Each structure stands twice: as structure tokens, then as C-alpha cells.
Symmetry: D2
Subunit: 146 residues, 4 copies
């Protein structure tokens, strides 16, 4: 993540319009629907057998809202991503064994969801800037592996 003042401000502005309740559950729901192998991490959540099932699942909705929260907290502290996400690095890596590529797939399901929700604001350059913030947050979460 190497953001200029102009990039930080444009992602900041974008993010200020994001409804965290509805974008997080939709982002996590698209990962389980589109990339169906991710469902093995969330079977405790219940029935995920159809799109309708996934998107209706309140455990999904609630957890997704927990994810975006953590991410906004990441955005308030670009300068200390490693400090901010250190404990989530151990949960995901040492306890949950979340495969590194899934962080990238979740990143992808978040950018498709922000584009459908904020079409005017999700320009090629805000896309580029969020893509390297999301890339560095994913580097920090898989750091118990290297």
C-alpha cells in the first residue's frame, strides 16, 4: 500500500458512503456462493445450500458486518496494518488454517460488491487504490505462514 494524499482522500470519500451492514454480508455471501469450497469454513453457520440459503443466513450477514468493521479499522491506520491485524493473523492462520488465496477471493468479492453499490464512485483509480490496501491487509493476515 503506497497511497498518495489524493488516493487516501478518494478511498476515504468512497468508504464514507458505504453501508457496512449491507455491503459486508453481500461480500461474504458472494464468496460462499461463487467460490463454493469456502463453505467448509462456515458450516457451523447452517444451511448454505443455495444462493437463497446463503444470502438469507443471518450468521453470514452478521459475520460479514464483523469483517468490514475490521477492514474500516484497517483503513483508519494504514501506517500500522501489522499492529492492527496481528491477532487476526493468528486466528486465521494458526487456528483456522485459512488458505492465503481465499483472502484474495474475499478481496475480489468485496470490490464487485462496492462496484454494484457505489457505481459512480467506484472509478478505475479508486478500484486501483482499494485493490492495494486490500492486498496489504491480506499480506498481514497470512503472515503466520512465512
Amino acid at each position: 500500500v503506497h497511497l498518495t494524499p489524493e488516493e487516501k482522500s478518494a478511498v476515504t470519500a468512497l468508504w464514507g458512503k458505504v453501508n457496512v451492514d449491507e455491503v459486508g454480508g453481500e461480500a461474504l455471501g458472494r464468496l460462499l456462493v461463487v467460490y463454493p469450497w469456502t463453505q467448509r469454513f462456515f458450516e457451523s453457520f447452517g444451511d448454505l445450500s443455495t444462493p437463497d440459503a446463503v444470502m438469507g443466513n443471518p450468521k453470514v450477514k452478521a459475520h460479514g458486518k464483523k469483517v468490514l468493521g475490521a477492514f474500516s479499522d484497517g483503513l483508519a491506520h494504514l501506517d500500522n496494518l501489522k499492529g492492527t491485524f496481528a491477532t487476526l493473523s493468528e486466528l486465521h492462520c494458526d487456528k483456522l488454517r485459512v488458505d492465503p488465496v481465499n483472502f484474495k477471493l474475499l478481496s475480489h468479492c468485496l470490490l464487485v460488491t462496492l462496484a454494484a453499490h457505489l457505481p459512480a464512485e467506484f472509478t478505475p483509480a479508486v478500484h486501483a487504490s482499494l485493490d492495494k490496501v486490500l492486498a496489504s491487509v491480506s499480506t498481514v493476515l497470512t503472515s503466520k505462514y512465512r
Copy 2:
């Protein structure tokens, strides 16, 4: 592709609302802005140094339309993708040396511009159907490396 009738027809239905001019250019434009290393393939196109520079660049837009037209045709030969993208596989593999990964990144830039242009239509289920078609077209255009 393991498209059920519903999946295939939902893809067929969203695709008819796509404005090829508008979407092919932005899709290729987001590839070049977000994943800058891909610019080495399109040096020929002239100025690509700023988001505005690659987005409005007329070669980008032209090419964008050509990429989507070949995708439209592939969509109508869903049962025979291998056969339809056969000469494009030699071009990309043998003549152009395009990394397999870049086809995955372009597919992702396309799902993002589609989400932004058709938000109401871009439901998690058609996003999943479209990702499968996109993945199949990618394994076929990458055929001549394996």
C-alpha cells in the same frame, strides 16, 4: 461450465443488456490501471501512464469492444467453447505469450465493470454463473500451454 438451463439462460439474459462499447473498454481499462504490469502487452497503444490516460485512450476502447465481441460469440457456442476460441488460443499462447494469470485478472476486471453497469441484475447467482463461463473461456484460451 456445468451450466444448468437456468444458469445458461440467466447468463444469456444479462448479456443482452450489456452495452459492449461501454463495458469492454472500461474492463480492459481497469486491467491496465489496477494491474499495471499488463501494460507491457499494449505498449503499442501509446499513453497509458494515468487512469485518465488509459481510460479515454481510443485504442483501449477499440480493443475492448473486440475482446467483448469474441466473448459474445463464445457465449453463443457454450457447448463448443474449445472449438470457437481455437484460433484465439494460438494467438494468445504462441504469438503473444500472455500469462495464464492475466486471463483471470481480466475476467475479474470484467465482473467488476459488469456489477457497476448492471447492479440490479448482478445477483450472486448470475455472478457465479458468469464466473464459471469466464473460467471455462480462460482454460480454453490457455489450452496451448498444456
Copy 3:
């Protein structure tokens, strides 16, 4: 696979020197030691916490032999890979939810143990032929996700 007679016969020839017992176990063992997140799929096997622990573990070795035997059979149906790995595709995709990426990582752990066991035979050209077969078997075992 776009195996020329020479490629197919060179693969056929190296494969006949492979000691399945010795190589299947070490291949799966290197997956689990090098990419630890894969251990979540084989928790059933008991102790996998140390390199020595996963390497000598008898379930690892047993399974290793089973994975290579299915690969031997796939090799002798090079022309019909889709057909031969068909029931193993449902198992890995629908029942086990194995990430597509893990098939690429296992293929890599196998090329490394093969290099080590057959160094004189593991020439860049048979390494390339073997990587193509491995890639084709992977796109087929991943069929039921696309």
C-alpha cells in the same frame, strides 16, 4: 495435455521407474509440511505437528500411495482423463471442498520429490511434459466447480 508422441512416451518411461510407496508419501508429506493450511483436510490422520510427525505418520504414507495409484491409472488414459478422474472430481469438489489451488501445490510438491528421486531422469523437457499432465489432471479434478 498437448502431448506429442515423444512427450507422452518420455512421461510413460519415467513413470515406470517411480517407486509409488516411497514417492506418494513424501509428496503428500511435503504438502503438509510446506503448506500447513492443507493439514485441515487430513486432521483425521492424527499427529502432523512436526516434519517427522507428518512424514512417518502411516496414514500419510498410505494415502500417498492411493493418490499415486490414481495418478498411474490417469496416466494410462491420457486421451480420456476427463472420463477416468470423473468420480474423483465429485469427491474432491462436492464432498471434500478442496480449494483448486491445493491441487497446484500438491503437483508442485510431487515434481520436487520426483526430481529428488530421479535426478538424472528429471530433465527440463520431462519436467515440462509432466507439468502439463499434472495441470490437465488438476483442471479435470476441479471440473465440478466450473
Copy 4:
């Protein structure tokens, strides 16, 4: 890269037996042969049209020896990988546009080459340790992208 004293010593010992002249050219030669799209970065080098052509190419041989050198220098300074490879980050990223995945493919072609050359020494644990050193050196070389 999080190496214990025991890991550092075991990679150190391994590396002390590596013939840098012959392992670097073989590692770079396997990347161009096996992953043929990488040849677009090295066409100035000449004829790379066959395995025989690639492996005989002295520009390949010499460059490969330049790569491993840089890598041994990386190994002498784990504690400052970012300081050591900062200029190579700008050459590869801003001047050469080397796609991030190719760093991982080169890593892979180096581990297959060390296994064929030092079979006794290339144990599952030295493999695991070199894999995360190589992973972090590749993170540092693609850092102009994030």
C-alpha cells in the same frame, strides 16, 4: 520468513554445497522451458526455441548465475531483505513489468533444481524453510506494485 536458529543453520548448510554456476542457469532454464510465456522477457537473449536451445544459451547460463548471486546475498541478510532488494524492486516492477506470479514460478523452478542437485540434503524441512525465504524475497521484489 520466520526462521528459527535450527532453520537458518539447515538452509545455510544446504546452500554451502550449492554450485551457483550450474544451479542458477538450470533454474532459469527450467522456467523458460516449462513456463514458455516467460520467454517474452528474455527474447534479447537469442534462440530459446527448444529445451536444447534454452539450456545451451550462455546468456541464460550467465544471467541465472547473476540471479542466484543476488539470492545468496539475500540469504546473508534476512534481517534486511527490503534494504538489500530495493533497487531490484524498481527494475523488475517499474522498468520490466514482471508479473508477480513469475517470481513464484522462478521460486518453484529453483526448488526443483536444488532437489535434483542435492537430493540428500533437500529434506521436507529445508524445503519448507527455503520456500518461505523465497516467498519473502518475492514479496520484496514486487513491492513497487502495492
